[PDB]
Amino acid sequence: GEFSVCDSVSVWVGDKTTATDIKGKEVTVLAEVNINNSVFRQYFFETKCRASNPVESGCRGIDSKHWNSYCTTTHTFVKALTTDEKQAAWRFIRIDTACVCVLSRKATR
Amino acid sequence: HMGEFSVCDSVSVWVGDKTTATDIKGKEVTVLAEVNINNSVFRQYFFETKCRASNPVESGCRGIDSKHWNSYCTTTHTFVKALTTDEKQAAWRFIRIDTACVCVLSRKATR
Amino acid sequence: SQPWHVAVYRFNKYQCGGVLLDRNWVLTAAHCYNDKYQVWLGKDDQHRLVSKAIPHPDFNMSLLNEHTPQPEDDYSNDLMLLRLSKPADITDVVKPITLPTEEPKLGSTCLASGTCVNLKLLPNEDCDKAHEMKVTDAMLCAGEMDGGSYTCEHDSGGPLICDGILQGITSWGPEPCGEPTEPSVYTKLIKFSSWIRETMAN
Amino acid sequence: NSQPWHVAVYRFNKYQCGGVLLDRNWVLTAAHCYNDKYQVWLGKEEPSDQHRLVSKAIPHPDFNMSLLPQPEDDYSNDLMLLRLSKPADITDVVKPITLPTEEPKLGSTCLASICVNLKLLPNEDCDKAHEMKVTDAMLCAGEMDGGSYTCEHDSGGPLICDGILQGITSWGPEPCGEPTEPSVYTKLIKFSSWIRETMANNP
Amino acid sequence: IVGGFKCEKNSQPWHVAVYRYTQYLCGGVLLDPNWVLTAAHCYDDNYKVWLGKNNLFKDEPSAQHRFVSKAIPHPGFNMSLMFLEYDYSNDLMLLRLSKPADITDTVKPITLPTEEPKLGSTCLASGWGSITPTKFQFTDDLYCVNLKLLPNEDCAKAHIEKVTDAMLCAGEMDGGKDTCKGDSGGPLICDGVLQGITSWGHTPCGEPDMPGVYTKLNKFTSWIKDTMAKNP
Amino acid sequence: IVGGFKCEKNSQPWHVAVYRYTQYLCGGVLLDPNWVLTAAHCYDDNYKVWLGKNNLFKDEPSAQHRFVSKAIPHPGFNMSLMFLEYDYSNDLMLLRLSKPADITDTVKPITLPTEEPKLGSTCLASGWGSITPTKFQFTDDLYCVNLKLLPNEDCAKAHIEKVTDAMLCAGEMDGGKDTCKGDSGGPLICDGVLQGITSWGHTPCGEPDMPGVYTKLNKFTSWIKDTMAKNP
Ligand SMILES: *[C@@H]1O[C@H](CO)[C@@H](O[C@@H]2O[C@H](CO)[C@@H](O)[C@H](O)[C@H]2NC(C)=O)[C@H](O)[C@H]1NC(C)=O
Ligand SMILES: *[C@H]1O[C@H](CO)[C@@H](O[C@@H]2O[C@H](CO)[C@@H](O)[C@H](O)[C@H]2NC(C)=O)[C@H](O)[C@H]1NC(C)=O
């Protein structure tokens, strides 16, 4: 019946230690949050691609003779507790969220 | 104009006027704009990405073999932990947020 | 490598999984009930239409289709047998699975399937703790916990093969997945063996 | 019918920058968009478009090339002139744009091309967001006071305040910065005599 | 055409091969020297028409080849088409040739229907579409096959897509016989009378309990005779 | 071929049209009675071969049509090709025919290079490809066009895709003439001697300062005779 142009996988991540801030620098994630002892733990919902070429032409269903295609992982920004050297605060970190298909024109005639 | 492009078009915005959300348990819940954690005020902003159209082109998504595949663009969601009210309590619950615009395929029965 | 897995294409509502029990029968959940069905075996592989829909009489139909999810819902007796209009061909990819004989051990390593899955069969109170639905003695409870990466999968009607043998059938659960550590509730298969074996023979 | 001066600078393996067409022969982008190879795409390939190769790259000398992320970085003098190998054709989709004449008024409405309505804020509102160093040779613009904000950042792109070209997008986190934090553009009047000079001495 | 036989040397003169410049596109029937009828979903930006052919790769002087100046598809066809429940209802398209066809022995028009076809009738379908069910292996020779006209319910039962009163259900139930990809626009001649045009079906083609769906031409005999004289 | 003239009847007997069942695929060049040469990116799962043709919809008796029994593409071609900087380097493929070409007046093989082409050489390219730059309008008649062999640097300048050792750059710099979609696998004969095959280029075709890229056959003459001798 129906199926995706690029395959994906969704998992919850609780073992995330390092991440990339919105400003572009590295930051270290903090497992437990809110009060002196684990009122709630930080879990992130991520979605990555399974392969760049699910079908060796790239994405499924593309007109291989006309287009060059590849599947790439798209990111999103989520607020999360982290630390830089010693200052710890709520920062927007880059989280994987989808698998989209990209296109270019095929020069082959 | 001359290079690479998305198979389905999208738009990314920061939302700060969000009041309602349908959480992970399927329940309608109210989203507050300001948090209160460790002596400070930070406003709740969510990064959303939706589709611009279901048909960026009549035949569906771009670059698809319209004489073999039926196609449409649809919006994909993700779960983000946010401050919410479920009439009685105020708690941090996972709410459904729009995140991507993916393309779906089916097989054409036309010969 | 899970040959018994079948996909129940319900027409204009969410898909359901199921188990192949006999060259002629398929076992899914009652909350998967609909007027039109289409059973996809394998992996257009094989696909047959369903002639005989049979929900366990002791299930609540009011619980069916778009209720606002309240935690006092007794999904108990969530079970259904579908009969194929034509038998399923056995291939190295389509194979049945036998009903349970022995009782489930708590602590067992179980498998589950699927916008694999290595579980452990926990006590029912662990499920009763997430006030999501009513958990009774006609149900099982399973969760997973070996790290900080839990996969988001919830297959309504799919199997729960514990200690190598069939033991349960995925009941109602949040979709695509639940809160990150939360257990899911499956329907216990032994408690209902008599009903199956008779409806499979009679 | 909107912004005909806009151009895309295909920097090959690096991030695609934007630019403004100033003459039929000259394109103006940002110095930090500097690379070895360039390809300039003007227009809305599918002909309405236009693509020219660049024959001369000329960054401002007074720029720090080591910058090619820390808050003590001076992006001052972030400007570059690219000369096309063949002239661009003026059409109903490709038009040049004039250098500024009058000074920009604070509080003016400005346009900006994983087109937006900005307001020219006082340089301090930028200084307070410790991202980079803000100097008198830069402008500060911010999208303001709605409920939801947009996510755009076109390096080398034009900042057109009240009909006239007033700036060129300098550095900034991409795809976009934070929810209310302003962006910094390179103030053009301040470099007007330099552009006119590099344009009359390199034909 | 899966599970068929090669058609006799010049048995189907109404058969047309619709091309798009140099590439094959669909089949069709010749109604009038100036008119050809095919299926709406073959809509492209150019139509050449090869008249009176049997083997697309041989020398046939009997053949003619014309161009098309106008194309008129039925307004009921959703052109977004060319969720799994699609409605390929009014799948039909008139195609006006440039210079008229030289009606000879090997190029003869076929007559429209004035009859509601009967169930159980033995129908004929032809075309240069695939002979293999899944892989698409088109044929050089024009193939024919004999199908049985089943009731519309057999189709609705087996297909997830809409079966409406503008559709004719035909095929074999034991399987092995069915039209397939590339046969569209071709005729479904039941009991000597043209009653349908090959539109949609299931891939793999020729599966048991999965009949093909053809456009019912007698619920459209009006739009054709109107649009034909109009010289649109 | 954009900006060309209709060829002179028996002028290109080495020219072949490679079909994939009923659909046009690419052009080609005949080297040995039982061997045809075309581009690698024309890789599909069946190759029929039309020999001695001038117009695809006309009746030509002098022609022949052979089936292909074996396909041998160069291992250098990244077949994932059937980021913008692609490398279509070793775009080459040998196609062994089932029953041999009947060498006659209208079906004659062209000899492989010994030479290394010189610049300024006027080269000829033929093909059933498009005569329109933007959208694709294939031709029934075989067109021929005379291009100039430019330095490989003219190509690398304008194209974002790698121009390399195994490539020949040819075209006109004013614009107006250049092979185009559908001309692939065709020949690029520079001064009576075959030197290349049509591989890739830019769409729109015939744009000023945008020459086409052809496969330099001289760097492959050892692979050809080796794989011809091994009768694969
Ligand atoms: C075959 O082609 C693929 C592209 O389809 C090549 O993979 C790409 O390699 C480039 C560098 O050459 C990377 O920038 C791309 O990101 C790669 N593609 C993908 C989808 O990630 C591959 O290297 C080529 N292989 C050979 C032997 O040429
Ligand atoms: C023709 O096809 C289109 C799809 O291409 C139909 O649109 C869909 O219609 C169904 C209901 O019939 C909806 O559930 C889908 O969500 C629709 N959306 C889209 C984006 O396809 C359309 O209805 C059909 N034609 C007519 C005349 O209605």
Ligand SMILES: *[C@@H]1O[C@H](CO)[C@@H](O)[C@H](O)[C@H]1NC(C)=O
């Ligand atoms: C059936 O389910 C509905 C909704 O949960 C409930 O209100 C009703 O009481 C149930 N039926 C019985 C007999 O308890």
Ligand SMILES: *[C@@H]1O[C@H](CO)[C@@H](O)[C@H](O)[C@H]1NC(C)=O
């Ligand atoms: C260039 O950048 C470095 C690091 O930001 C800085 O220390 C140095 O002073 C700069 N160069 C000049 C000439 O200011």
Ligand SMILES: [Zn+2]
């Ligand atoms: Zn099937």
Ligand SMILES: [Zn+2]
């Ligand atoms: Zn171009």
